[PDB]
Design a protein around this ligand. Sequence first.
Ligand SMILES: CC(=O)OC[C@H](N)C(=O)O
Ligand SMILES: CC(=O)OC[C@H](N)C(=O)O
Lengths: 239, 239
Amino acid sequence: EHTWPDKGSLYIATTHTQARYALPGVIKGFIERYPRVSLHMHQGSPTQIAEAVSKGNADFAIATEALHLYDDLVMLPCYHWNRSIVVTPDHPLAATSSVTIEALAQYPLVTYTFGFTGRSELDTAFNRAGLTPRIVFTATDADVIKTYVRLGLGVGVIASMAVDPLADPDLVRIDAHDIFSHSTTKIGFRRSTFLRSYMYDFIQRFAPHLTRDVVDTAVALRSNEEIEAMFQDIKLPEK
Amino acid sequence: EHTWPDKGSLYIATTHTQARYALPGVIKGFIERYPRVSLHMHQGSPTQIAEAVSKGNADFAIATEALHLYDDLVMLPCYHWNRSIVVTPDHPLAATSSVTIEALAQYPLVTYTFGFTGRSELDTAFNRAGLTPRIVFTATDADVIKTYVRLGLGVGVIASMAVDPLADPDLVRIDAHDIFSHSTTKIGFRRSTFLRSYMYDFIQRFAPHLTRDVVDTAVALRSNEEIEAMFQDIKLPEK
Ligand SMILES: CC(=O)OC[C@H](N)C(=O)O
Ligand SMILES: CC(=O)OC[C@H](N)C(=O)O
């Protein structure tokens, strides 16, 4: 009843951050439309995620590993995203008129770890202002991080999508898009993967600008550089 | 005011599961008692966690990696824990009089990945009953897993401590201690680490049976085997 009868396997290798905040909608949508597609899902670190799809278990990889050893696979820009700073309401940073990277910094921090969902600005955006802050905590998911900010171990820096005013009503969102450059989530797959219609539909459902035609031409280029050139004048979804 | 003035560094390498469910209480307790101890915390995979403490960044490692390449460090049994099966209330397994590993199995599963917080039974406890089930999903944390069970991608198997009737009131806990053997969380540190009083206190706060004296004698032995022998007749906390 309003479903495609397409039969086939779809194996995704993705990160926590992706699996938790960016993927659920799509997946629920997808699996409802394709009851004959065996959707398998495997979470993990950028290198294994690179490894899995590369040679050669999973069909797609979904991650902010704009990082390398990715050349084998066709990488496609999906969206940008940045970070919010979260604190307990009783924090000095709460009652502050737009904080700076130096105004941060004076504090002990609970961030992500490198490399795993873009802390690849943190430190490398800190040494930039010649700064080195106390990182009392590095983790891989925001929910752990959030709960340790509730403890008061330090100030947290997480993806803006990882704050949910509903889910997180004991924290203060402070947007830091000014403070840190955005991160790009891409989607990979090796050239030799035959692209199935459900796959295009999935790509499309996850990144609206990635239509069959866009996709095809992006893979017609011999480079991920060339691809990112293709979109350098396309405004991505900003998440 | 009722705090120890002890000054020093305490760096912990632990897993998601540990950081999220087993560690928060202790840490909050600890840091309140030792405002001069620089508590640093770093989450990650068993191998890096082994690596971090080993050679030789972090003081303690806290994990269910009873797995090896651990010989360098003194490993101490902390507690046992097992798994619950979680499903949507509308699931066939909900209305079931104590399910078997075969009664499971007939289903698509959302579990942990190997190696990362004990799925090292799953498959190796499945091939045992000669079984091979559909694993539509492997992740590293229960919250991701739970949410995909809410989607209906499959049946979830997570740590019993990762279900929280308060936090998770849309799921069905089904205890599987019968079904799968328990896992042991241990705590490591290399022999050469001078043991500080706050460290003993911390060890103690996390594993009540690990008193100064127990600890000392456990390290007086030349083996983790010998240590586990020491406790083979001690009933551990069961979590
Ligand atoms: C990042 C987020 O909140 O969801 C975006 C999702 N990729 C979509 O476009 O459906
Ligand atoms: C596993 C859990 O829920 O907490 C146990 C904790 N290690 C303690 O003994 O304080």
